Design a protein around this ligand. Structure first.
Ligand SMILES: Nc1ncnc2c1ncn2[C@@H]1O[C@H](COP(=O)(O)OP(=O)(O)O)[C@@H](O)[C@H]1O
Ligand SMILES: Nc1ncnc2c1ncn2[C@@H]1O[C@H](COP(=O)(O)OP(=O)(O)O)[C@@H](O)[C@H]1O
Ligand SMILES: O=P(O)(O)OC[C@H]1O[C@@](CO)(OP(=O)(O)O)[C@@H](O)[C@@H]1O
Ligand SMILES: O=P(O)(O)OC[C@H]1O[C@@](CO)(OP(=O)(O)O)[C@@H](O)[C@@H]1O
Ligand SMILES: O=P(O)(O)OC[C@H]1O[C@](O)(CO)[C@@H](O)[C@@H]1O
Ligand SMILES: O=P(O)(O)OC[C@H]1O[C@](O)(CO)[C@@H](O)[C@@H]1O
Lengths: 449, 449
């Protein structure tokens, strides 16, 4: 009925004429995601990636790798003997490591504002899992299990070579031995490993059993929206090798006049960039390649130069500056000085009058991201702000740094799957253009001054 | 490089200066969705609903119910004897009915522009399914299977009472007998019913096995984006009883001046509507109720009147009229006569300059819809165009009629799950307001006139 619009987010909230003594209060249950499976099954991989996605879409998440807790308690690794079921002392340390991790999980979900906590450990026994349930139960946390099952020696072998042997545990080992020691380590967990059994013992557990690297899934009783998304997400990511290329439209006319937004076409240099891009793609010699653009003339003209089928996406359109479209930063500061200042102090959440915020872009780009995960080779020709959002997702950058990532014109960012994330390579196509990057940039409201 | 922007959709396409003799060409493989399971398992329900969703998001889909083909070939039903495995003649008719349906499936996917075809029949035998694969294989159609398994007599019994007994097959029967005849009919299919076996015989088939009304899922090798969505969709819909209420913000100031868009607050009547709405909600006496609004002041003020926690969604914001925001239809016709005319001849695809189209709303509302499916009781306070889109989804209205659906101010649309769809009830809260509904509305370009 009677409200006021927040200055940064432009959100309508009710005016709280806090009486004499303003009462605050503060601070949807948090979720503990429990990874399950033998080592070298991709649990850490899934953990890190899922967390990357969730934080990007706005759900604060953190991974709690029990392994790191162990490396912290036991300075240097020696061999798999540490993991033998008969190693009574090591068992105490391992148990202590897991409980210490949960301790931090409690502090995260109950005292640091986190919503999701990924408990990354083998958690291969009903006994370990029951303990976690109890823990969750007493702290009022929902529990969701993700088990990875893979009995393909080629896969396990490969997984070991990609992330295991180069672990700090094997700092003083050659491939031959690290590989041999890890295999023995896995054997240690095999005897008491009790996979999840939803059609029986684990009927009441909320879980997803990822089988044969995503070939098949077994989902049991999803509880909420959050558990709905993850499941959706896990069923769309793959591990096939491929490359993702990201770049902006060749320089446009508004770029030259320092004008934001609009729908201007390519400048002579922008067109030059287009051919260069065509040459670059040709040289990459990719068997197949999808090309995506926004619906703004700028990106489509660039795509045309490629002579390849491309698909337009309205979601890739540049951020909408509202009443500031087509205006220069100078004109914005002069006409909307307060709006200008507000954006500089909170560039991620700031929303343009009748326009958008970087936050809006993320919600808007979520489906572009979901498709990128499903695809193989893809070239995305877009815009500065948009590019920053996608890049933030792939490179796991925070919301605070997202609106400042450097995404120059005429430059292609080549992204490749490496280890637990994405490797990025920058390739400038050698065509001049303007630079549209802008970095971040009291006494009277106090006595004495 | 050199393109032109389409007048209606504002989409940048390359100029095709069709040479002397313009060549056209024309017209992603189509998909045949194969339903599997004993009768009264919700296959038709799933079929119709999935098709409702798909067409709404833009993927042309149609259901091919073999049952209707049979009722068409055999004027009147008599009893389950028709379905006995020893009824050699009926078997010929049934086979003929299925093949006739596929025939229409071919014509749909290959000659009518359809993308998805839902083959709705029990398809309970490996033999029937293998036939469908062959069919698909020879027409270059992908094949996806959805099997519904339910061994809960209470469920089957209930399903029978809700959609079976009231079938035209039982026009001359009382509940007692229709129920008894249907049970015998189901027995007929039980002997040769071979459920899907993904971990064996059906390993290479793309399928999802819905178990215990969604309690559990078994997904096997999703092939594309399309099979990704459906799966996601099926895992989010439920059949619990609940109600969805939809209405617009109480009348606002711009409403009074005949002004579109903007972010004006409630008028005195709009506020009156707010209290009325509060009274209405109270009288509905719902155990729980979620309230959703847009981020425009109008809907939030309305929600405030309820004194209930509500969640804002940027996706629910009214359609964006671009450079026409805050303008009157009169001012639009006068200032942008051509834009005005263009919108009237293609109201669904038309996009406002630097604004949106009803088509954009759908893509934008997809996640609102997905959440509505996951929830129980929900009150959505929004806007005319937005409301029309949601209503179009629930009432299965076409894109052509969506921008004209009647969604008056101060009126609540109560939606309830009934049969295979949604029942709608309109409740006007008895508070005056303006009417913002607008219906649809050569010689010189020819010789002689
Ligand atoms: N669902 C999966 N099944 C098997 N291997 C996978 C899966 N997802 C990812 N991987 C692979 O596993 C490796 C990462 O394994 P890691 O996460 O360290 O295993 P773990 O934590 O289970 O000991 C990568 O090479 C990755 O490609
Ligand atoms: N996954 C499901 N399992 C069991 N019953 C369901 C499911 N989905 C919907 N239903 C119920 O089934 C009924 C509709 O059944 P119908 O589609 O005619 O069955 P069928 O086509 O299998 O003979 C409705 O009462 C609906 O609530
Ligand atoms: O509590 P458990 O089940 O042992 O799981 C965590 C353990 O797994 C290890 C299994 O090798 O994996 P990780 O690679 O995740 O570090 C150990 O470091 C750690 O002790
Ligand atoms: O080809 P089949 O496997 O018999 O499936 C379609 C058949 O199922 C029926 C099963 O009762 O169901 P429906 O309610 O879908 O009409 C019959 O009308 C029809 O003959
Ligand atoms: O996020 P920033 O640093 O304000 O830059 C935003 C601008 O970048 C551009 O893509 C190019 O200036 C504009 O269209 C957009 O308004
Ligand atoms: O779809 P229509 O019939 O053009 O009406 C659209 C308009 O409806 C409103 O919600 C009210 O006029 C406007 O904000 C919006 O522009």
């Amino acid at each position: 009925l009677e409200l006021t619009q927040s200055r940064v987010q432009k959100i309508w909230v009710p005016v709280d004429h806090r009486p004499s003594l303003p009462r605050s209060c503060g601070p949807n249950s948090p979720t503990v995601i429990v990874m399950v499976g033998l080592p070298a099954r991709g649990k850490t991989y899934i953990s890190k990636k899922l967390t990357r996605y969730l934080n990007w879409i706005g759900v604060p998440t953190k991974v709690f790798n029990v392994g790191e807790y162990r490396r912290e308690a036991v300075k240097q690794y020696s061999s798999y003997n540490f993991f033998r079921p008969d190693n009574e002392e090591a068992m105490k340390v391992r148990k202590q490591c897991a409980l210490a991790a949960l301790r931090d999980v409690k502090s995260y979900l109950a005292k640091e504002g986190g919503q999701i906590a990924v408990f990354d450990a083998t958690n291969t026994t009903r006994e370990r899992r029951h303990m976690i349930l109890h823990f969750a139960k007493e702290n009022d946390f929902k529990a969701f299990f993700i088990e990875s099952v893979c009995d393909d020696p080629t896969v396990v072998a490969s997984n070991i070579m990609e992330v295991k042997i180069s672990s700090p545990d094997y700092k003083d080992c050659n491939s031959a031995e690290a590989m041999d020691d890890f295999m023995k380590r896995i054997s240690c967990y095999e005897a008491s490993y009790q996979p999840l059994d939803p059609d029986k013992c684990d009927r009441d557990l909320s879980l997803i059993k990822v089988i044969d690297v995503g070939r098949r899934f077994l989902v049991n009783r999803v509880q909420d929206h959050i558990q709905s998304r993850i499941v959706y997400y896990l069923m769309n990511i793959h591990v096939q090798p491929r490359t993702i290329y990201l770049c902006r439209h060749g320089e446009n006319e508004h770029n030259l006049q320092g004008r934001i937004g609009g729908d201007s076409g390519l400048s002579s240099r922008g067109k030059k960039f287009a051919s260069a891009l065509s040459k670059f793609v040709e040289e990459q010699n990719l068997k197949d390649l999808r090309v995506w653009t926004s619906q703004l003339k700028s990106t489509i003209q660039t795509a045309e130069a490629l002579r390849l089928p491309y698909e337009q996406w309205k979601a890739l359109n540049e951020i909408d500056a509202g009443v500031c479209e087509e205006l220069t930063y100078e004109e914005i500061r002069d006409t909307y000085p307060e709006e200008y200042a507000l954006r500089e102090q909170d560039k991620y959440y700031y929303r343009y009058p009748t326009g958008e915020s970087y936050q809006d872009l993320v919600q808007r780009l979520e489906p572009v991201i979901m498709e990128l995960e499903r695809q193989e080779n893809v070239l995305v020709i877009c815009h500065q702000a948009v590019l920053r959002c996608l890049l933030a997702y792939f490179l796991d950058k925070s919301a605070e740094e997202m609106p400042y990532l450097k995404c120059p014109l005429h430059t292609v960012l080549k992204l490749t799957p490496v280890a637990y994330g994405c490797r990025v390579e920058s390739i400038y196509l050698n065509v001049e253009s303007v630079c549209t990057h802008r970095e971040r940039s009291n006494p009277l409201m106090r006595r004495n001054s």
